[PDB]
Chains A and B, each alone.
Chain A
């Protein structure tokens, strides 16, 4: 799974005098929130149907997580990039599609 997050910075006093390296803290928080969100949902729904609820849950979780830090960062958009399975099972997925064609 990969994810991209776009954010702005407001009230620079908070950004400068609250947390050391706020960007790294936000990256760690984003990774934690993404792990927590993906943990709850099943694989196939993440692959195909949940790609909208996954992002919606991740953005809310990140906003709730970075609240105590009181960093100056405000959040614009959290967008879900790709949730491809590993290559080894990707071979099996391609084999399944070829199996459908062979069945015909």
Chain B
């Protein structure tokens, strides 16, 4: 008593959804993408240290910052037809692999493994067009 405190971290998979945002394809075709990510805590101590106080929002912020970068870098090389016709989720799987294992038993500092976060699935919910392009279609 009065010496040891306890902090609780939920090991259940957390779901973080991203609101509508615009991405630029290889032909400057603007797209509006809705996507969600599912993540779990790998090392509870490391996750508690990396995010001040173990707050979920602080980790979600870093996850947003990295996921946006990797997703934009992957979309930049692709056609809008390539994105829509994609059914195996190859780009999403590559984004997940980049998020889990970064670029330089060594752990890259920019990887999510350097934090206490493991990304288990990345999926895209809907791909829309700007209202002008939709009206033209």
Contact = CB atoms under 8 A, between A and B. Distances in A.
Contact of B130 (A44, A55, A76, A94): A94
Prevailing SS type, chain A contact patch: helix
A94 B25 CA distance: 13
A44 to B, nearest CB: 8
A77 B114 CA distance: 11
Interface of A: 4, 6, 44, 47-49, 51-52, 55, 76-77, 79-84, 90, 93-98, 101-102
B133 A94 contact: yes
B54 interface: no
A98 B76 CA distance: 21
B88 interface: no
Nearest to A47: B24
Contacts, number: 70
Given A97-B132, A101-B136, A81 B65 contact: yes
A82 B76 CA distance: 11
A92 B62 CA distance: 34
B68 interface: yes
B94 to A, nearest CB: 13
Interface stretch (B4-12, B26-34, B37-45, B119-127): B26-34
Interface string B64-76: 0110110011001
Contact of B114 (A44, A47, A76): A76
B62 A6 contact: yes
Contact of A77 (B26, B76, B110, B133): B110
